[PDB]
Design a protein around this ligand. Sequence first.
Ligand SMILES: *[C@@H]1O[C@H](CO)[C@@H](O[C@@H]2O[C@H](CO)[C@@H](O)[C@H](O)[C@H]2NC(C)=O)[C@H](O)[C@H]1NC(C)=O
Ligand SMILES: *[C@@H]1O[C@H](CO)[C@@H](O[C@@H]2O[C@H](CO)[C@@H](O)[C@H](O)[C@H]2NC(C)=O)[C@H](O)[C@H]1NC(C)=O
Ligand SMILES: *[C@@H]1O[C@H](CO)[C@@H](O[C@@H]2O[C@H](CO)[C@@H](O)[C@H](O)[C@H]2NC(C)=O)[C@H](O)[C@H]1NC(C)=O
Ligand SMILES: *[C@@H]1O[C@H](CO)[C@@H](O)[C@H](O)[C@H]1NC(C)=O
Ligand SMILES: *[C@@H]1O[C@H](CO)[C@@H](O)[C@H](O)[C@H]1NC(C)=O
Ligand SMILES: *[C@@H]1O[C@H](CO)[C@@H](O)[C@H](O)[C@H]1NC(C)=O
Ligand SMILES: *[C@@H]1O[C@H](CO)[C@@H](O)[C@H](O)[C@H]1NC(C)=O
Lengths: 36, 48, 96, 48, 98, 42
Amino acid sequence: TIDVFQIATLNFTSPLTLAPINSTGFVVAVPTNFTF
Amino acid sequence: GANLRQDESIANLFSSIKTQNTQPLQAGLNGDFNLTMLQIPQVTTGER
Amino acid sequence: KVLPPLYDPYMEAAYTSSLLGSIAGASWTAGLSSFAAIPFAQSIFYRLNGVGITQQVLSENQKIIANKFNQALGAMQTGFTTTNLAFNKVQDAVNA
Amino acid sequence: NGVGITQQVLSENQKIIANKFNQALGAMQTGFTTTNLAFNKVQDAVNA
Amino acid sequence: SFAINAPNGLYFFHVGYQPTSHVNATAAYGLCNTENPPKCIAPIDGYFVLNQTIDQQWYYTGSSFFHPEPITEANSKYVSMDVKFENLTNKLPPPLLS
Amino acid sequence: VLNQTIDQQWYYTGSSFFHPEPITEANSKYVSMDVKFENLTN
Ligand SMILES: *[C@@H]1O[C@H](CO)[C@@H](O[C@@H]2O[C@H](CO)[C@@H](O)[C@H](O)[C@H]2NC(C)=O)[C@H](O)[C@H]1NC(C)=O
Ligand SMILES: *[C@@H]1O[C@H](CO)[C@@H](O[C@@H]2O[C@H](CO)[C@@H](O)[C@H](O)[C@H]2NC(C)=O)[C@H](O)[C@H]1NC(C)=O
Ligand SMILES: *[C@@H]1O[C@H](CO)[C@@H](O[C@@H]2O[C@H](CO)[C@@H](O)[C@H](O)[C@H]2NC(C)=O)[C@H](O)[C@H]1NC(C)=O
Ligand SMILES: *[C@@H]1O[C@H](CO)[C@@H](O)[C@H](O)[C@H]1NC(C)=O
Ligand SMILES: *[C@@H]1O[C@H](CO)[C@@H](O)[C@H](O)[C@H]1NC(C)=O
Ligand SMILES: *[C@@H]1O[C@H](CO)[C@@H](O)[C@H](O)[C@H]1NC(C)=O
Ligand SMILES: *[C@@H]1O[C@H](CO)[C@@H](O)[C@H](O)[C@H]1NC(C)=O
């Protein structure tokens, strides 16, 4: 940050997994906000 | 330049992880379908 | 010099695991903006229904379809021989 | 509507959708930098 | 998508629908009543969600935007019986009414 | 299809599997008149 280079590890964090519900139907993530 | 382009292409291909929603697949039988062949085994003795 | 690959094999494993976890879904909606937490077996049966197999057949032949799918997944092992074209392609890339 | 947005939502958020589209078209300018991959491809073709 | 002229080709601006905020909605595979010949319906380009407009009162919402609406023949299709469908005895949608 | 569940009694079957079922509005759609269509009186 302009003294010594640092070594970091690449790691892709996938979005939080939607665990299925044990109810009759299923749970769906429907958008409420959007962009183009 | 060739190596940089290859790295960029592979990063572009692997970038789908960051914007892909998934569900936690059950270990072994998923209902009646056996997906043990395609799943990474989990062993506590050593590293993943 | 042979440069190391951009990603660790753990990152490739994460990519393939995300691919495996992304298979299940609604598979009937107009777009790709919503994610439905439909289990894998339900998604496979819905894919079969979309193929042209009615729900009566799917409900009757549940265990039969599951057993055939498991037999196919088990027979996936035998394809890693020199006879298979895709394995030949893998070895050809390695040889190149 | 074909994407999966019902006509009620489209009628309700007409100006909001238009404003978001205009913001996207106005932010299209920012992509002509060395960070973008497509602009890098353009400059790569010119350089070749 | 908009295509403009580039020095040695065409430059494409692909405008896409990107959602930012999501809502977890209780959805149903389908709904139908209790008749000797059952009459089961499924959503068209959407889901049968549970949340009220502002439980056994099911609404219809679009795939790409959450906005519950009454279930009619405009946004539903008739399908054969599926055992995962919800059996409705009260608050039947007009498609499910005999 | 024509075969019975187990002729002028017509059933519906899926493309990928033969299993005749009664014809309803779930598996049929209304279309304009076609000459090759079967005229049913019973
Ligand atoms: C599901 O598939 C897995 C993997 O193919 C099966 O696990 C194998 O079971 C056999 C028979 O007991 C063992 O010899 C193998 O060592 C197991 N592992 C592998 C990797 O082949 C499993 O039996 C199948 N069935 C169920 C119900 O889980
Ligand atoms: C809705 O009702 C149907 C028809 O009664 C149910 O389907 C039956 O479910 C039982 C119990 O699981 C099975 O043994 C039968 O084989 C199913 N079919 C028939 C034709 O009876 C269904 O389970 C009900 N669904 C819900 C969500 O309550
Ligand atoms: C079903 O009935 C229709 C309507 O009567 C028939 O269509 C006519 O067929 C005749 C004889 O081939 C033609 O000359 C006419 O032009 C057709 N159209 C009309 C409007 O009359 C049709 O052939 C019958 N189909 C079968 C399979 O018997
Ligand atoms: C969508 O998000 C914008 C900001 O990105 C906000 O101003 C607007 O009120 C939101 N609309 C909703 C939540 O309906
Ligand atoms: C939906 O549930 C997930 C976990 O399954 C959670 O991470 C997310 O924040 C929830 N979204 C809401 C409550 O809007
Ligand atoms: C709101 O939506 C949720 C989705 O999980 C549903 O369970 C709940 O009943 C709804 N509430 C109302 C008041 O509509
Ligand atoms: C069985 O199917 C054949 C198909 O060629 C049909 O001609 C025949 O009438 C059917 N028989 C019965 C008893 O349904």
